[PDB]
């Protein structure tokens, strides 16, 4: 495996750099690879051969090397910048490439984004089918960290909450989504259930109660 | 343009062999090699193996034991098995056309060395600081660059768009899908968010369209939680004209592969 930083930070607007070491025999032999893997996306080829640039690369991703050290640098730093990126070099054989460990990049200097929440009860059907799950959608919001808890009426819930690692969205916001699984009795037996999100020291608090229909 | 389509199952038993499909389009497998890469959660990109436009194969030589990769130009598909998976082999699994190339003749000195012919032997990289005609010696840092100097290229072209592959002993579960309509209370004026929920599969993954595809704008389709059960739960949404709630026909299109279910639910709006 070829030795990155595990990661790395740049404002918006600045330039970054990663780094990739090896050996003689893999960084050496003059032919580093780039990729870029946007969560969610497929993989990019970013440079081949130390530094050219593949097909539809912006010129702002630069490739570079010297010795058995290879270097990818990112200028003009935007937020759809941030990803995993990884360096290849084929070692003794065209046909044996080898990956370097992975550098997750962070654009700094982003503005805070609120969330939006949009919390579901649980439908007819479902309840029919004996079962009831209460569906807490947030959406819009950076950074990607966020505190759900749920209420039954006033009082704390901790069984039965699911909840996402928040990931994110095309337009560089986050996105994550919390369960709730209840029987139908704990459903209707209740006067509401809430789902409270927590960004930033903000919450966001919505509310469902089984007399809606 | 140049396509890669992966197929094959998303769940594989632990001790059994997976095997998976590349479908070409876009140009001939008899011009360009194809190649395997696959990516386990959180770790890093792994090379798997390639088969040149002459059907020679290269390996991972870690992983060679368990490999096997075989191409039908006819059929225009690359082929790649491996043996006694364990839960070290769920990945997402891409298949791409790779650049491979051997060269020879690099006698360019690295940075911090100069090419030179005035040593002892003939021309090589001495260390731009030494002095002398020894010094493309080893003693000295340098060498004589005398006959074989092959180089080796690689890099992927274009990439597949990737298959997710579970290796589990826990069994296949198809999704429940239920409707997720926006009460009196839920709208958000001119516009109602509108969605399926889908419910407790297992492997990943699951795909949502609305109308047949043709609903796009307002789609918003949420990765999925993994529950403490083992089971996955995902929802997709919509935004709509609150307007319409009631005389437009709006129907998610689910997809989960892996337990060969499709559901065609409409949402209804609710009366409250």
């Known amino acids: ?213 | 343009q140049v396509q890669l389509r992966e197929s094959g199952p998303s769940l594989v038993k632990p001790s059994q062999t997976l095997s998976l499909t590349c479908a070409a389009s876009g140009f001939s497998l008899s011009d360009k090699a194809v190649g395997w890469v696959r990516r386990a959660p959180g770790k890093a990109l792994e090379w798997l193996g390639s088969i040149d436009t002459g059907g020679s194969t290269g390996y991972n030589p870690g992983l060679k034991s368990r490999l096997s990769i075989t191409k039908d130009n006819s059929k225009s598909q690359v082929s790649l098995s491996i043996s006694s998976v364990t839960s070290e082999d769920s990945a997402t699994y891409y298949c791409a056309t790779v650049h491979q190339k051997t060269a020879e003749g690099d006698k360019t000195c690295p940075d911090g060395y100069e090419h030179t012919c005035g040593c002892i032997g003939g021309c090589g990289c001495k260390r731009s600081a030494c002095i002398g005609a020894l010094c493309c010696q080893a003693s000295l840092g340098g060498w004589l660059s005398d006959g074989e100097t092959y180089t080796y290229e690689f890099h992927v072209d274009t990439w597949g768009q990737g298959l997710v592959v579970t290796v589990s002993s826990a069994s296949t579960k198809g999704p429940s899908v239920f409707p997720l309509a926006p009460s009196s209370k839920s709208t958000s004026g001119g516009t109602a968010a509108l969605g399926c929920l889908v419910k407790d599969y297992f492997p990943e993954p699951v795909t949502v369209s609305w109308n047949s595809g043709a609903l796009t704008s307002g789609v918003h389709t949420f990765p999925a939680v993994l529950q403490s059960s083992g089971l996955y739960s995902l929802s997709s949404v919509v935004t709509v004209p609150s307007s319409s709630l009631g005389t437009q026909t709006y129907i998610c299109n689910v997809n989960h592969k892996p337990s060969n279910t499709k559901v065609d639910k409409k949402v209804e709006p609710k009366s409250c």
Request: aromatic fraction near 8%; charged fraction near 15%.
């Open chain 1, 1 to 213: 495996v070829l030795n990155q930083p595990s990661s790395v930070s740049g404002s918006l607007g600045q330039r970054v750099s990663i780094t990739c070491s090896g050996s003689s025999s893999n960084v050496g032999n003059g032919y580093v690879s780039w990729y870029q893997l946007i969560p969610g996306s497929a993989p990019r080829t970013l440079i081949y051969g130390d530094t050219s640039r593949a097909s539809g690369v912006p010129d702002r991703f630069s490739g570079s090397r010297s010795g058995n050290t290879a270097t990818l640098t990112i200028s003009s730093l935007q937020a759809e910048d941030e990803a995993d990126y990884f360096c290849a070099s084929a070692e003794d054989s065209s046909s044996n490439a080898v990956f370097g460990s992975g550098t997750t990049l962070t654009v700094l200097g982003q503005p805070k984004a609120a969330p939006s929440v949009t919390l579901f009860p649980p439908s007819s059907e479902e309840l029919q089918a004996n079962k009831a799950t209460l569906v807490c959608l947030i959406s819009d919001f950076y950074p990607g960290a966020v505190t759900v808890a749920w209420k039954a009426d006033s009082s704390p819930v901790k069984a039965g909450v699911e909840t996402t690692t928040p990931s994110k969205q095309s337009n560089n916001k986050y996105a994550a989504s919390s369960y709730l699984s209840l029987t139908p009795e704990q459903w209707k037996s209740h006067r509401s259930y809430s789902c409270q999100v927590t960004h930033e020291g903000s919450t966001v608090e919505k509310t469902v109660a089984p007399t809606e229909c």
